[PDB]
Symmetry: D2
Subunit: 390 residues, 4 copies
C-alpha cells in the first residue's frame, strides 16, 4: 500500500513570549488540523486516527492531541495519541501514521506537531512530599524536560558548542550560514512563498484582536548586529542566538491516506512517502545523527544526494545543517531555500512535520520533485523522511 500526503497546513512560528503567547498549544494544534482537513477535500467525520508530537504537555490538561482534535472540529469517534520523540515528535507522528496505513489499521489519518514554549509551565519536584528545610530549585519545564540532556543536564546548545569546535566550525563560517537564512526567510516572507504552507491566526488580547500570517522571528531581527552578538552557551563560545534555532510557538498537520483511499475519493494528494529511517547514537552526538539518518534513508529507498532536488534539514544549530551538508556533500542552494529555524523558530514538537510540508511546498514553487527532510533529536537521534510530488 503506497502512502500519500493529501493536504498540509501549519501556524506562523511565534518567538518566545511573542505573537502567539496568548494561544495554548492545543488551540494552535486545532488551527493546523482544522485547515489540514478542509484543504484535503475530506470531512472531519472521515478522519479515523490523529497522532500529534508534543514535547512539553505540562499544563496542557488531559490528552493534549484529544483536545486539539475536538477543537479542529473532529468527531469524538476519531481516536487521538500524543507522542514525544523530542524534536522529531512531528516526523515520528508521520512515520507512525505511514506504517499504520501500510498495516491496514486505518485508511485516513492526520499526523502533525504542536508547541507553545511560551506557556510551558514551571515544576516543583519535592513540594508533593515536602521540602522540609533549606532553599530549593524551581525548574523551567521547557529546559528540564526539553532542552537539557537527562544524564548531564547540559543544554542541547552546550553539546552543539563541543561538537562544533571538534569539527572546526569558526564564528565566521557559522555566521555565513545564519546570515543567508535571515535573507531567505525574508525573501520568502516577501515573495509570499510561505502563505501557501501557512494558515493565519486570530489572537485576542487587551489591544483588541489581531491576524498573524507571517513568521515572527525574522521580522524582529537585525542582520548587521550578527558578528557582535555575545556567545550563548560558553563565555568564549562560537555559538550565539543568530546561528542557534529560536525558542518559538506553533503547530502543523498533514492528512495521510493510502494511494487507493485517495484514488477512490477522487482526491489528488500533494505527495507520496517513499520511505523513512531512524538514526540513533550517543546523546553527545545528537548534532550529527542527521548524517546517518539520511545515510539509512538513501540506503532503504535506493536514493543518493544526486537524485534529490531539495532537502529540509532543521537548523537546530547552523552547524547541524552545515556538517550534514559538509559530510553528505550537499549544495547550499538546495537546502532550506526559504530559510531554516535560526530565522523562523523551532516549536520543538511541531518542526518535524512543518519541514515535511515546507519541503513538499518547495518542490512545488521550484517545480522540483524528489525531496528529503531530516532533523536531529536531543537524546542523540535523527529521523529522515523521503517523499515525491504527485
Amino acid at each position: 500500500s503506497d502512502i500519500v500526503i493529501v493536504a498540509g497546513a501549519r501556524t506562523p512560528m511565534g518567538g518566545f513570549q511573542g505573537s502567539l503567547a496568548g494561544v495554548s498549544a492545543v488551540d494552535l494544534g486545532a488551527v493546523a488540523i482544522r485547515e489540514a482537513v478542509q484543504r484535503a477535500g475530506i470531512a472531519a467525520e472521515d478522519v479515523q486516527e490523529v497522532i500529534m508530537g508534543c514535547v512539553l504537555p505540562a499544563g496542557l490538561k488531559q490528552g493534549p492531541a484529544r483536545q486539539a482534535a475536538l477543537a479542529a472540529g473532529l468527531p469524538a469517534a476519531t481516536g487521538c495519541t500524543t507522542i514525544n520523540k523530542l524534536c522529531g515528535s512531528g516526523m515520528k507522528a508521520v512515520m507512525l501514521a505511514h506504517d499504520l496505513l501500510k498495516a491496514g489499521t486505518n485508511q485516513v489519518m492526520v499526523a502533525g506537531g504542536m508547541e507553545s514554549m511560551s506557556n510551558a509551565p514551571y515544576v516543583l519536584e519535592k513540594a508533593r512530599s515536602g521540602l522540609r528545610m533549606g532553599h530549593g530549585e524551581i525548574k523551567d519545564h521547557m529546559f528540564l524536560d526539553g532542552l537539557e540532556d537527562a544524564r548531564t543536564g547540559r543544554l542541547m546548545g552546550s553539546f552543539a558548542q563541543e561538537t562544533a569546535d571538534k569539527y572546526g566550525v569558526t564564528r565566521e563560517e557559522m555566521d555565513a550560514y545564519a546570515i543567508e537564512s535571515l535573507k531567505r526567510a525574508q525573501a520568502a516572507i516577501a515573495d509570499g512563498s510561505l502563505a501557501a504552507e501557512i494558515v493565519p491566526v486570530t489572537v485576542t488580547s487587551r489591544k483588541g484582536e489581531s491576524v498573524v500570517k507571517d513568521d515572527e522571528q525574522p521580522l524582529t531581527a537585525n542582520l548587521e548586529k550578527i558578528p557582535s552578538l555575545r556567545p550563548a552557551f560558553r563565555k568564549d563560545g562560537t555559538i550565539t542566538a543568530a546561528n542557534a534555532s529560536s525558542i518559538s510557538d506553533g503547530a502543523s498537520a498533514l492528512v495521510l491516506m493510502t494511494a487507493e483511499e485517495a484514488q477512490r475519493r477522487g482526491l489528488k494528494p500533494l505527495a507520496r512517502i517513499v520511505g523513512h529511517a531512524t538514526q540513533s547514537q550517543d546523546p553527545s552526538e545528537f548534532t550529527l545523527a542527521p548524517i546517518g539518518a539520511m545515510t539509512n534513508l538513501f540506503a532503504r529507498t535506493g536514493w543518493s544526494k544526486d537524485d534529490v532536488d531539495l532537502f529540509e534539514i532543521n537548523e537546530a544549530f547552523a552547524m547541524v545543517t552545515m556538517l550534514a551538508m559538509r559530510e553528505h556533500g550537499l549544495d547550499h542552494a538546495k537546502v532550506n531555500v526559504y530559510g531554516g529555524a535560526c530565522a523562523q523558530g523551532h516549536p520543538v514538537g511541531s518542526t518535524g512535520s512543518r519541514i515535511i510540508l515546507t519541503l513538499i511546498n518547495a518542490l512545488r514553487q521550484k517545480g522540483g520533485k524528489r525531496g528529503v527532510a531530516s532533523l536531529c533529536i536531543g537524546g542523540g537521534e535523527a529521523t529522515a523522511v523521503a517523499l515525491e510530488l504527485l
Copy 2:
C-alpha cells in the same frame, strides 16, 4: 507476517508514596525492559525500536523512554519513543509495535509503559510571565494532565460516579465485585500465580537495601473495611477507594517480533497477537468504551465471546468491568481471574501492556488458548487486543 509476543515483564505496583517511590519511572521502565529482553533469550543489541507509554512526563527529564532503554542496557543504536494515549498508552505502545512489525520497519521491538504517580511534580502556570498581583494556583501535574477531563476539569472518578448512577450500579453491587478482586488478588500472591510475569525491583530503605516482588495494595488492603469506606467523587456517592483503582507506580515491557523472526532465531514465542481495535466517543462516557472496543475487536477478528477462554478488562472502577461484562454477557469466573486495578493498583502509563501480560500468564497457568484484553481511556476511548498461546 504473523506477529508474536516473545516474552514480557512487569514490576510490582506500589501504592501512592510507598514501596516503589524512591525509584523513578525511567528507572522502573529499565528493570522491566531488561528482564523482558533477557527472558526472550535475545541480546540488547538485537532490539531495533522501543515504544514506552507515560501519561506524566513532568520532572522525568528529556526522553523518558530514551532513559528507560539506555539505563536497562539497550545500546544507543536503538530508537526510543514516548507515547501518551492516557491510561491506554501501554496497550497502544504494543498496538503501534504490532503495526510497525507488520509494516516491515522493524523485526525486533520492545513496547510497554512506565509511571511513578508518587513522583509526579506540581506546576505554576504564570510564574514565567508574571502573577502581577493577587493569589495564584499551584497545580498537581497528575490531576491537571492525567486524572481530570480537559473540557470540564472533572476527575475520571466523577464521570464514573454519574454513569454508575445512570446505569443504576448500587453501592452493594460494586463492593461484591471488589470484595472478589482482592480475594483473587491475595490468592495469586499467596500461591505465586504472578511470579512468572513479575521482575522484582530493588529499593533503599533506612535499613539498607530490600527487594519488592509482590504488589503493594493487596497487602495494605483490609477486606472487612470495603463495606464502610467513604465515597471518593461525590459526598453520597457509590464509588470508594475499594471499587476505584488506586494511584500506583510501576512499569511493564513486552518483546514483540514477526513469527519468522522468533523461528529464524530458534525461539518459542509465548503467544500471538490475533488483532486489536479502538473505540472513541464523548469524553464523559469513557467507562462504556471498552464494550465498543471489544465489539470492534470481535468484528475485525471474527471471534465471538464464546471463542474466548480468558478476559483482561482493566478495573479503573469496578463499574467499568461490571458493565463491559453485563452488555457482552461475560462470565465473572473467566474475567480478571487473578484480580485487577481495584485490588492490585493502576500505574496509568503501564496498566495497558501489563494486562496483555497477566492474560498470557493466566492462559498458560489455567490452561486456556484464546484471550481478550481491553481498557477504558480518559478522553472517551478504549483499546482492545486479542491473542492466542502457541
Copy 3:
C-alpha cells in the same frame, strides 16, 4: 525632656512595578536614613538606635532595619529594631522613638519606615510538610499579611466600600475629593513644594534620578468620573479615590531637646504629644476620628489651634469622614495632596506625612500641625507637632 524632629528625608513614591522597582525597600530606607542624618547636620556615629516600619519583610533577608542602617552608612554599633503596626508602621517607629528618648534609653534616634510593595514576594504554606495530592494556592504576601483582614480574608477597600455606604458616601462626593487631591499634587510638583522633604533616588538599568512622586505624572484628571470600581461590581471606590500601591521610604532624626541644643542644631519641629485608637477591624476607616479625639484629650488642644492637618488618604473617604466628624476645613488638610494621588508605600507613610506636614506648616506659614492615618485590625495613630 521635650522631643525635637531635627531633620528628615523621604524618597519619591513610585508606582506598583514602577520607577523604584529597581531598588529594594532596604536600599530606599538607606537613601532616606543617610539623607536624614546629613540634614540633621550630625555624623552617622552620633545616631544611637534606628527603628523602621516594615509591613512586608519577606525576602528582604535578616533584620531589614539593621541592613538599611548599615547601607545608609551608620556604624555596626547602631541598635536596629524592625517593626510592623501595618500602615501606621512609620508613625509608630516615631512614637517608639518619642518614648525611648523620653525614658533616658537614648539621645539621638532615627525612625521612619520603608516599603517595596513592588518586590513583595509570593508564599506557599503546605510545601514544607508536603502538598501530597490536589491543587494549591500560591499567596501574594502583599494581600496575605498587608491588605486582607485576618478574620475574613476581605481586602481593606472592601471594608471601606462597606463603611462609605453605611455612612452614605456617593461616587460623586468621593471623585470630587480625588480631583482636588490630584490637582494639589500636580500643583506641588510644578511649584517644587516637595523638593525640601524629597531626596532624589538614582536607579541604574544606564542610570536616572527619580525626584517627583510618579502617580501624579501618569494620572489623567479627565478620567476620574470614568474609572470602574475596584472592590464590588456596584462600587463607589476606584483607582482614583483609593490609595495606590507604592515603592518609597521615609526617615526622621528625633532628639531630646537637651541633645538638640547641646549640638548647636536648629530643629524643624517639637513633638507635643501622640495617641493610638484601637477598635473593630471593620471600622478601620473610622479609627482616625478616635485617634485625634484621644490626641485632643491628651494635648489639651481643639481642631481650633491646628493650622494644617495631614490625615493620610488611605481611601478618599477616610479623610472625608474625619473632615465631617471633627469639623475640619478641606483648605487646612492634605494641602499638597495625599495618598490617593502621590502614593502609599504602606510601612513608610506613617513618617512621611509627619515630614510633609512640617514642610507645609513652614512654606504655608503655620505653627501647630496634626498627623493621623488609619490602620488594619481596627486602629489608628495620631501625632501632634509644633514648629520652632
Copy 4:
C-alpha cells in the same frame, strides 16, 4: 517610674514539625497572653497596649500581634504592634514595654513573642515580574529572613563554627556543656520545676484532643548520641545538633506595669526590671555580642557578676554561653540552671522573653534575689535585662 513584671506564662517549646506544628504562631501567643493576664489578677480590658516579637511573619496574616491579642480575649480597644530584633525580638518587646511605661504612655502593657518555624512558608522572589526563562530558586523564609546573615547568606551556625575555631573551643568542650544542659532539662521536666512558668497547650490531629505540657527536645534527646553526631555546619566541624539551639515553636508573654499601678490594684509583683542594655557589632561577631551586652548592663545598672545570683544566657550554640562564661568569669552552676536552647529549643521570636521567665521562676525555686538574662542577636547584636525579685 519603676517597672514590675506581675506575671508571665510560656507554651512548651515544640520541635521542628513536632508536637505544636498544628497550632499557628498566633494561637500560641494567644494561649500565652491569656494565661499571662489570668495569672496577673487583672481583666483583659485593663491591658492598654501589646508588643509581640515575631521574626518569621510571612503567611501569619495581617497584624500577627493584633490577631493574638484578640484571640487571647483582649478587647479591640487594647491596641497591638509586632516587632523584629531577630533572636532577641522577645526581650526587645519587654524593653520597649519598660520604656513606654517609664515615659507615661500606658499603665498596663503585655510584652512577649511567638514563632512557629514549623509553619514558616516558602517564598518565590521572581514570581510577580516573571521568571522569563531558566531555573529559579524557592527560598526558605526561616533561612532567608531568619537564620542567614544578609551580607553573606552564611548560617548563624557557619559564623558560630568559625568563631569557635578562632577562640579555640574543642568539640569535646561543647559536648561536655551540651551533656550538662540536657541532664538539667531532663531532671527539670521530671521533678516538675518548669510547671509554674509553663502553660499547657491543647491541640487536635486525627484521634482527637492532646495536652502538650513538656518541652519536646529533652524527651526525644539521647545523651549517648551527643559525641557520635555528625558536624552540623562545616565539613569536619565541631558544632553538632546537640550543641546548637534546636529549630522550635512556642510563645511567651509577660504582664508589665509601673510599680505604683501594680500597688493601686493591690498586686504582689514577681520582680522589678532594674535595667536593660543593648550591644551591637559587626554581624560575624554576633556570637560574642552577649559579652558587650552584660558589660554595658553592669555599666548602666551599677551591678557586677558577684551581685548576679543566676544568669539566663540563651545558648544559641553551646559556645555562646561558654565564651560568655569564660570572659565574665561565670560558673555553669549559676547559669541556665534548668538547661537551655540546645536541650529545650529556640523559638527565635520567643526565647528573649521566655528566658526572663525561667530566670525569675529559677530565682523563686532555688533561693536568690538578682538575675541577668542576655541572648545573641543575628546581625552582630545582643540585648540583656537585669531584674530583682520582690
